[PDB]
Amino acid sequence: PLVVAASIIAILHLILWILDRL
Amino acid sequence: PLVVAASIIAILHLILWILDRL
Amino acid sequence: PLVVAASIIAILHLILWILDRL
Amino acid sequence: PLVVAASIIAILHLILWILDRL
Numbered sequence A, B, C, D: 001p002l003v004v005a006a007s008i009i010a011i012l013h014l015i016l017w018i019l020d021r022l
């Protein structure tokens, strides 16, 4: 569950960071 | 342990980054 | 596949962030 | 190696980001 959660969070983080930079 | 550590770190990184942006 | 996707994304995210900072 | 590398990179990314902010 930890690795699954982190994987999802890593994807979320990239998306959010892109939106922040835009 | 590397993968467990990186997973924890990914989650922490997102939390810190959100807090930084706010 | 989720872990593979997240692994690719983690590498991409670092590259993008370094280029943004530079 | 993909997962090992991504794990290393996730740790490096947080270290760099914390240092960048500080």
Ligand SMILES: OC[C@@H](O)[C@H](O)[C@@H](O)CO
Residues within 6 Å of the ligand: A015
């Ligand atoms: O998994 C892809 C999802 O549809 C969203 O995260 C979009 O990419 C957001 O634009």
Ligand SMILES: *C(=O)c1ccc(Br)cc1
Residues within 6 Å of the ligand: A001, A002, A003, A004, A005
């Ligand atoms: C949750 O992501 C998880 C925990 C242990 C093992 Br093994 C696989 C996945």
Ligand SMILES: *C(=O)c1ccc(Br)cc1
Residues within 6 Å of the ligand: B001, B002, B003, B004, B005
């Ligand atoms: C530490 O996260 C770790 C190392 C080797 C294997 Br296999 C699983 C997890």
Ligand SMILES: *C(=O)c1ccc(Br)cc1
Residues within 6 Å of the ligand: C001, C002, C003, C004, C005
């Ligand atoms: C996809 O990355 C993936 C899914 C299940 C298991 Br077990 C390993 C990898």
Ligand SMILES: *C(=O)c1ccc(Br)cc1
Residues within 6 Å of the ligand: D001, D002, D003, D004, D005
């Ligand atoms: C590299 O990280 C790697 C590739 C295949 C398997 Br199985 C474990 C680790």
